[PDB]
């Protein structure tokens, strides 16, 4: 029979991780008698008097938040890393070894509006969000080789506070993913003489099958090797090492691309769409980081609808990540909707 | 200053995967205003007239389940892999490439009792399950190099049907986890001339800090490099390549170990403790597999209680797995409860 990706299971390679993804095109056909998701409330007040993240509010620690009107960053009250933790008793033990971990964790409130997420923020407000990301990265980068900007959106994504915002965790070392991505990109570069992701963008631009968002300076695709159902990869069309290297134009364009990307997500099921997202750029290790290409990953759990997510469990944990629909199907569904948040368009 | 694992963040290495785990011992003290889990109901019928996995019931596809006893295995009505899928077009492209994928998927009903989870089952019944896992492994191993026995238990673990049971997915290739575990174990062996987990078992025996369950032939510990809060690694004290290689004594002993382990898990929060678990053993690839050591991993998501789980999200996906308590603290908590199921 003729192989048909559209219908035959197969594995696809993730050149960033050196790992495969198993695709079973029709897995989703099976009866779902599992957990039903809890979709989020449409009606939240712009200011919650109890919210530990709201402006002019006291934190769990008593610390009072400023009367902030744009973004706001403060050191996490429960940081995952400290800048002066004692060094660990590092050894060579092939079985039980440990290593030192220093760094910090900061919290970023997107805006004082307790009820408005990224797709609902103005391009101007989004641009401030980017400037803050850059600011944070430049400062921490001065001290730590790995600065990780991210965000957990929605209960399904492990958020512990409903205020819109993100986090920044800095590390004295290169975490798993960073070291891997770093090495893999470096090898490709050494061999191909061009940045892996830069070449990837070209290919995607010429194809279109997986394109979701395309702006003057950015591209958002459902990567070939996507893991999560509607997972996306957001990249600059031009070669850029870190977030801190974006030009002002790329910067405002990024704000636009984000709004569009997240609006499509929310438009997909006509609901606030949960996800985990974050930025990957060259580490501040003082090395030649030409092999790098800045990029953001978006990992959303929703699959069938607003109340049915994907669960990366048994097989995925013990063997390999699996997907129940192609990246092409995912991208197509994402292209079908509007890139204007339903709340803003009034449709 | 003076380093103390329960107070200071640090990273631990997982030699099975060659990856690190970030430990931040006081992270769970933060307020939690996130999701609240829904704990599984305690009272369920022994037979559910509408259950697709229940004895004598008609499946989704209309096929009928027999009036079985003990375990019941059938080919998944929506298998994720097939035995005859056409080969993919293989290339050596550095950015966009695919590979073939063949195999099968089977469903294993633990017993005809719709309401009895593993720890609720007798050692005899559990022994029957072990026999089936073995038969299934030996069987599929004839055709596939990778046989994956597993179980998704509880809503939080993405289970799609409440009947107590698991799955077996076979693959014509070695999936990610298999390939790496094989490679790393092989490397270790070549250098140490001893199996990685065999040595590991001894090192743990000589410590006891992370021990949770210990029987004549098995050991269950919160691995040194544990990711999930109360994760455990279950393994035979003696070198055993695959589950099919167990002696009958080892097998009957494994059932005992399983009952004990799972009873402790349920007792931790006095609820049916969810998890994803599976078995890892030598692949059927006709190669020198002495480096292998059979073992089971249990990945339970619960963290603070019956309604609050651990989430591997943002930082974890973009950077590195992280934990809010030490392997040692968790092991202690597990040891603190009775190995007698709270509802026996
Ligand atoms: O008064 C307050 C209230 C909250 N916070 C912080 O606000 C953050 C909100 O972060 P969010 O992204 O919602 O989730 P977290 O509580 O950090 O935990 C999630 O994100 C982590 C990093 O991905 C994971 O390790 C957890 O398992 C996952 O639940 C938390 O870190 C809190 O420590 C404060 O600093 N002060
Ligand atoms: O009439 C029926 C009813 C059910 N089933 C099968 O019963 C199985 C029950 O397996 P379970 O462990 O409960 O979950 P799954 O539905 O397979 O899916 C989970 O397990 C997979 C393997 O880890 C993941 O890919 C998913 O994302 C995760 O939700 C399913 O696969 C069904 O296809 C049949 O074959 N016939
Ligand atoms: Fe990346
Ligand atoms: Fe393993
Ligand atoms: K958030
Ligand atoms: K199950
Ligand atoms: Zn708020
Ligand atoms: Zn049943």
Curated annotation (Swiss-Prot), chain B:
Cofactor(s) the record lists: Zn(2+)
Residues annotated as binding Zn(2+): 51, 54, 114, 163
Listed result of changing residue 163 to N: Decreases enzyme activity 10000-fold
Record-listed Fe cation binding positions: 181, 280, 295, 297
EC number(s) given by UniProt: 2.7.7.12
Effect of residue 54 to S: Decreases enzyme activity 600-fold
One protein family per Pfam: GalP_UDP_transf
Resulting phenotype, residue 160 to A: 7000-fold reduction in specific activity
PANTHER family: GALACTOSE-1-PHOSPHATE URIDYLYLTRANSFERASE
Annotated protein name in UniProt: Galactose-1-phosphate uridylyltransferase
Lineage, opening ranks: Bacteria, Pseudomonadati, Pseudomonadota, Gammaproteobacteria, Enterobacterales
């Amino acid at each position: 029979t003729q192989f048909n990706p559209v219908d035959h299971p197969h594995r696809r390679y993730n050149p960033l991780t050196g790992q495969w993804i198993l695709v079973s095109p029709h897995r989703a056909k099976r009866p779902w008698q599992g957990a039903q998701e809890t979709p989020a409330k449409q009606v939240l007040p712009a200011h919650d008097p109890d919210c530990f993240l709201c402006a002019g509010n006291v934190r769990v620690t008593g610390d009072k938040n400023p009367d902030y009107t744009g973004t706001y960053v403060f050191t996490n009250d429960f940081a995952a890393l400290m800048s002066d933790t004692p060094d660990a008793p590092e050894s060579h033990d092939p079985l039980m070894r440990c290593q030192s971990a220093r760094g910090t964790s900061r919290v970023i409130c997107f805006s004082p509006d307790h009820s408005k997420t990224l797709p609902e923020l103005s391009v101007a407000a989004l641009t401030e969000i980017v400037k803050t990301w850059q600011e944070q990265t430049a400062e921490l980068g001065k001290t730590y080789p790995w600065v990780q900007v991210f965000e957990n959106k929605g209960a399904a994504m492990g958020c512990s506070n409903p205020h819109p915002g993100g986090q920044i965790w800095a590390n004295s070392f290169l975490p798993n993913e960073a070291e891997r991505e770093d090495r893999l990109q470096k090898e490709y570069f050494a061999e191909q003489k061009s940045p892996m992701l830069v070449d990837y963008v070209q290919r995607e631009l010429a194809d279109g099958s997986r394109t979701v968002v395309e702006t003057e300076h950015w591209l958002a695709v459902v990567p070939y090797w996507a893991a999560w159902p509607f997972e996306t990869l957001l990249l600059p069309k031009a070669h850029v090492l870190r977030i801190t290297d974006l030009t002002d134009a790329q910067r405002s364009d990024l704000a636009l691309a984000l709004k569009k990307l997240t609006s499509r997500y929310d438009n997909l099921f006509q609901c606030s769409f949960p996800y985990s997202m974050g930025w990957h750029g060259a580490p501040f290790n003082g090395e030649e980081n030409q092999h790098w290409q800045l990029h953001a990953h978006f990992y959303p759990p929703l699959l069938r609808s607003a109340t049915v997510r994907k669960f990366m469990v048994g097989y995925e944990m013990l063997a390999e990540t699996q997907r129940d629909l192609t990246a092409e199907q995912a991208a197509e569904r994402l292209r079908a909707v509007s890139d204007i948040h339903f709340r803003e368009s009034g449709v």
